């Protein structure tokens, strides 16, 4: 099987830069008929893919000219110039040449802003959960850059690991941010046997975390 | 004008079989190949096969030659590919494709376990100045939900943070940010809707 390796994994770029996308194959993608079967493929968050750039360089109907294809053998290129804000996505490089059809791992495309720090807020469990002999404590951190996050839990003062569980949001289309949510699922019991719940937010925008708690007395 | 329409998803016990359709439209059916393809994670794509429509033969990858039977059907211009022996590694989306467009893809899960609906709780602060609100949804099975927040008025202040597994089954959260001029002078809703068991919950968060 032809092997297709996209470099880089994520490509971090400023809106109007020119980002460069790489596709190498194991073998040549130059078929038999003189033709190389070589696509480029845009996927949105949430949608389908759609068609870039086929044969190489010609680009679909619809699809704007600083999108450009180029390439031959076992090298290739996608070139953007400049990024627009609806070009956030991930970008498959695809050869139709050989059976099977293979497609690269795809090379999420990532927009660059300035550092911001994240919004923390604590949710102490509602009262209506806690009917079912559980509790969760949700903590939300959203709009903050870049990815790179941390999140940690302390009872009474103490840090808590077992029963977190953490999602990340993909980056806002509008601001560029990235959002996290982060739960610490107790026993009822166990919560109603502690006092302060703490959330702890570590960012590079400070060396210091934001912390943000509650006395379940209050 | 052309346009792939998918089946909707499904819910498939391990070592059952499913089948799953691609009616096209706008176009000669005869004309084009329709190529079928697995998604894993929403990142990694695999290419299964197509299938000479006229003449009904099938290119096959490889890895999936046991798994996957394409045909068509001439006369209602429609696509078939049925996946046996089913395991949780065919849990994906499968996208069927034309060279020129692709469907909205299908949704398979396989699992034994059953359509589970979700439980929904309210996340309101607790005992500046802008306020985030938010609703859990926790427990369900299998994807997906939507949480609406005020019939979709509120649109762009609002985080949708993707499921992750607990004890089996899912767990999201949603949170929206208003002003605090806002709530709770006017009112906030979530609304969970959860196709798979045919539910929808609507939560007014109080302060």
Redesign the interface.
Do not use: A, C, D, H
């Given at each position: 099987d032809v092997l297709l390796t996209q470099t880089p994994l994520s490509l971090p770029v400023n809106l109007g830069d020119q980002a460069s996308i790489s596709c190498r194959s194991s073998q040549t993608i130059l078929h038999s008929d003189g033709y190389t079967y070589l696509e480029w493929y845009l996927?949105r968050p949430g949608q389908?893919?759609?068609?870039l750039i086929?044969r190489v360089y010609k680009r679909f109907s619809g699809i704007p000219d600083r999108f450009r294809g180029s390439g031959s053998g076992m090298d290739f290129t996608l070139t953007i110039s400049g990024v627009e804000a609806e070009d956030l996505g991930?970008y498959?490089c695809?050869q139709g040449s050989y059976?099977?059809?293979?497609?690269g791992?795809?090379t999420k495309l990532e927009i660059k802003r300035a550092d911001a720090a994240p919004?923390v807020?604590?949710?102490?469990?509602?009262s209506?959960?806690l009917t079912?002999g559980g509790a969760?404590v949700?903590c939300?951190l959203?709009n903050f850059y870049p990815k790179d996050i941390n999140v940690k839990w302390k009872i009474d003062g103490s840090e808590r690991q077992n029963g977190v569980?953490?999602?990340?949001?993909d980056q806002d289309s509008?601001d560029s941010t990235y959002?996290?949510?982060s739960?610490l699922?107790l026993t009822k019991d166990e919560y109603e046997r502690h006092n302060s719940y703490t959330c702890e937010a570590t960012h590079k925008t400070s060396t210091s975390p934001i912390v943000k708690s509650?006395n379940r007395n209050? | 004008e052309v346009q792939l329409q998918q089946s909707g998803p499904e819910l498939i016990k391990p070592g059952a079989s499913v089948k799953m359709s691609c009616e096209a439209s706008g176009y000669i059916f005869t004309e084009y190949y329709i190529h079928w393809v697995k998604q894993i994670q929403g990142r990694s794509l695999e290419w299964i096969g197509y299938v000479h429509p006229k003449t009904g033969d099938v290119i096959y990858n490889q890895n999936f030659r046991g798994k996957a039977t394409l045909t068509v059907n001439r006369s209602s211009n429609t696509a078939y590919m049925e996946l046996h022996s089913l395991t949780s590694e065919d849990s994906a989306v499968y996208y069927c494709a034309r060279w020129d467009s692709w469907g909205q893809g299908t949704t398979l899960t396989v699992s034994s376990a059953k359509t589970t609906p979700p439980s929904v709780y309210p996340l309101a602060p607790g005992c500046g100045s802008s306020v985030t609100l938010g609703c859990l949804v926790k427990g369900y099975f299998p994807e997906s939900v939507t949480v609406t927040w005020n019939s979709g008025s509120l649109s762009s202040s609002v985080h949708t943070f993707p499921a992750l597994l607990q004890s089996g089954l899912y767990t999201m959260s949603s949170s929206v940010t208003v002003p605090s001029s806002t709530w709770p002078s006017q009112t906030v809703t979530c609304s969970v809707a959860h196709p798979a068991s045919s539910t929808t919950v609507d939560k007014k968060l109080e302060p």
């Open positions: 996927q389908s893919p759609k068609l086929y991930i498959y695809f059976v099977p059809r293979t497609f791992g795809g919004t807020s604590i949710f102490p469990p509602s209506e959960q079912s969760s949700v939300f959203n569980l953490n999602s990340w949001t509008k959002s996290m949510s739960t699922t509650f209050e | -």
